[PDB]
Design a protein around this nucleic acid. Structure first.
Lengths: 185, 124, 57, 141
RNA sequence: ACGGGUGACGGGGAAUCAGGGUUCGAUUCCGGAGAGGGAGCCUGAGAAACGGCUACCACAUCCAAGGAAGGCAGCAGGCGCGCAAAUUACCCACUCCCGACCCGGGGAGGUAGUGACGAAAAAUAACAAUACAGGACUCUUUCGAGGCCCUGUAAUUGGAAUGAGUCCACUUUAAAUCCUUUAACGAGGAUCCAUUGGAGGGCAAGUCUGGUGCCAGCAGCCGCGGUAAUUCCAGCUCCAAU
């Protein structure tokens, strides 16, 4: 007997079919608009959607006024409305079903540095995140996957401690600034 | 520009001490040494640095902020009394003996053979 | 034609000439982005029958 | 279903058991004769002492002499015809060298031309004969 | 029923899933059993105990030949059975136990080592200008002009960034290591160089070159190879996971 957990799960399911012609074209432009790095990445935005959607059909089997459905209603909904996927005027949960993969893929921080007046291309953004430049209320995220809260969005910026913000000159600017002193002498 | 703030304060009458969660802000430099941290509490609580004990500091990604669980006592007399040994050894006032638990188990099982006031001769 | 004398015959008698050189390969998104362009954002709806991407007449 | 009663429940259940023994991919399963026969005895690989190199002819339409081996296993002390795969790799078995035999694709059912043969090689003493083909490791002297 | 068999310890559970189902469960929680193989008892509130005791059987350790003791399915380890599984490492600091105890002790437990058994985050580049190629659009039956919005691949040219790394000290802690923090140094082929498998059809991608001449081999099934092979052996190209 030991003092540990063993606990974990996977996050992605792989499609029953291999070598299709209608699917091989449509997952590869999810890699263009937003700038993802492999399939795996994509496959899990779905699995999280798929998960939401099966619980919704679980609740719709129940009657109205059934106290589980009301409570677990609210929760399932607000859980999509603190992060702006659903909108205020769709409390009702038919509306949860008619709800697709592109709205999740643009909450991801990667996409949230392309759109806000602080990155030139999208494929620049997944290299600003990972070179530890940008931050979200005095706290540095290093992780595109970060799904973003709708409370936060007005607080994203360049971190204080940075050459692309306030700070001291860098590795390669300061070296060829230091090289100009070494050359003239 | 090093700044301390305490957090969750309590007093044990029945262990003879102040305890609290010391909280640090340090933008710009490496995490800080404890003979600096101690002596900065000492005019937060106007004692000497001697009695106070601060251990454990987890730091924060992005740089900035660390979190400790320091505790302040009344007199030195008591400070040896009601507190661990390792958390005196650090401050230079306790020293355990010079045999790790290889030696000492070999020497128990040779006393276990010998009988009576013959047991003292196996030990020198 | 061929007991256990006749073995390795063709892996043997082929013309072992060397492999070539080329400029260095890329991986990761940086790659994938590469192919995303090829097949979508540019290209012309060319007349009639489409030739595959490894085509030679 | 055919015996529709409400308290039949066993009449119904003594009949399917009876039946399922007619099922093959099962009886082959639920008697001891499948594992009595089998060389590996119940297993995914099992090593053995080679003893002679042997060419087997292929069956018709096709023709071409196919290069095999005749192994004795350890555990059982049993004798199998095996089969080398790659081109020019038979020059790598010396007689009475040791090999890690495997299965061959479809479980107790051969592949293609060569009759009887259900087994094949992965290793030749601690290094894989795949590698030897490429040349990524070479043989000790 | 009785007899036999079971690659049978039981249960909380696991993998697969439209609904119904079919397999698995020696294993961190409960309940059973056993300490090479049977048998029997001393001490006790609590044993048919076995890191207690006395036999016999199978096996194994010394002798000055009369004698005498041995039992890792506890931790590390090692010989064997094999397709088949790690260090004779370090502490009571935590966690809890036992005792005459606030004070000893604990391979129970904690901590490092080996570990592509599985699960989760996630690098191998990004951005400017000069050649060059495509579509709006204002106009041109068609040349050309603007390319504002670009859209793209080119050992052309240019500096901005960073994580791999080397290394002072803080931190971590029973004492170390790891992660977290920080000065000093650290990239143009960014040699600081991604594989493993396939290209006739099922099933994504060459009727291309240069060998072999039912031979050598491929091919899970249908099949290939008959001296012009879309299939072997290989040269350039290409698809799918990464």
């Amino acid at each position: 007997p030991v003092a540990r957990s063993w606990v974990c799960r996977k996050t992605y399911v792989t499609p029953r079919r291999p070598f299709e012609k209608s699917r091989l074209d449509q997952e590869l432009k999810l890699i263009g608009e937003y700038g993802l790095r492999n399939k795996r990445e994509v496959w899990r935005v779905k699995f999280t959607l798929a998960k939401i959607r099966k619980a919704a059909r679980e609740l719709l089997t129940l009657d109205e006024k059934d106290p589980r459905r009301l409570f677990e209603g609210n929760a399932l909904l607000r859980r999509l409305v603190r992060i702006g996927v659903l909108d205020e005027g769709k409390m009702k949960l038919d509306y949860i079903l008619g709800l697709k993969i592109e709205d999740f893929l643009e909450r991801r921080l990667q996409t949230q540095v392309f759109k806000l007046g602080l990155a030139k291309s999208i494929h620049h953004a997944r290299v600003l995140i990972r070179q530890r430049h940008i931050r979200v209320r005095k706290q540095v995220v290093n992780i595109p996957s970060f799904i973003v809260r709708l409370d936060s969005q007005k607080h994203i910026d360049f971190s204080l401690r940075s050459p692309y913000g306030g700070g001291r000159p860098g590795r390669v600017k300061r070296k060829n600034a230091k090289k100009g002193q070494g050359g003239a002498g | 520009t090093v700044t301390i703030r305490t957090r969750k304060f309590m007093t044990n009458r029945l262990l003879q001490r102040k305890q609290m969660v010391i909280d640090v802000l340090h933008p710009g430099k490496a995490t800080v040494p404890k003979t600096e941290i101690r002596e900065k509490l000492a005019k937060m609580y106007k004692t000497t640095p001697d009695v106070i004990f601060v251990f454990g500091f987890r730091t924060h990604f992005g740089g900035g902020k660390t979190t400790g669980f320091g505790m302040i006592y009344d007199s030195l007399d008591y400070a040896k009394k009601n507190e661990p040994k390792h958390r005196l050894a650090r401050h230079g006032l306790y020293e355990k003996k010079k045999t790790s638990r290889k030696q000492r188990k070999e020497r128990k099982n040779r006393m276990k053979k010998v009988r009576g006031t013959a047991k003292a001769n196996v030990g020198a | 034609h061929g007991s256990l004398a006749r073995v390795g015959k063709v892996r043997g008698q082929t013309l072992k000439v060397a492999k070539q050189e080329k400029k260095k390969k890329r991986t990761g998104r940086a790659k994938r982005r590469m192919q995303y362009n090829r097949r979508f954002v540019n290209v012309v709806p060319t007349f009639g029958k489409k030739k595959g991407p490894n085509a030679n007449s | 279903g055919k015996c529709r009663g409400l308290r039949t429940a066993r009449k119904l259940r003594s009949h399917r058991r009876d039946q399922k023994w007619h099922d093959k991919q099962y009886k082959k399963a639920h008697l001891g004769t499948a594992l009595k026969a089998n060389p590996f005895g119940g297993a995914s690989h099992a090593k053995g002492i080679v003893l002679e190199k042997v060419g087997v002819e292929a069956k018709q339409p096709n023709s071409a002499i196919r290069k095999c081996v005749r192994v004795q296993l350890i555990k059982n002390g049993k004798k199998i015809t095996a089969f080398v795969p790659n081109d020019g790799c038979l020059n790598f078995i010396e007689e009475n060298d040791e090999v890690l035999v495997a299965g061959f694709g479809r479980k107790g059912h051969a592949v293609g031309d060569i009759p009887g043969v259900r087994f094949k090689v992965v290793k030749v003493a601690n290094v894989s004969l795949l590698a030897l083909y490429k040349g990524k490791k070479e043989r000790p002297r």
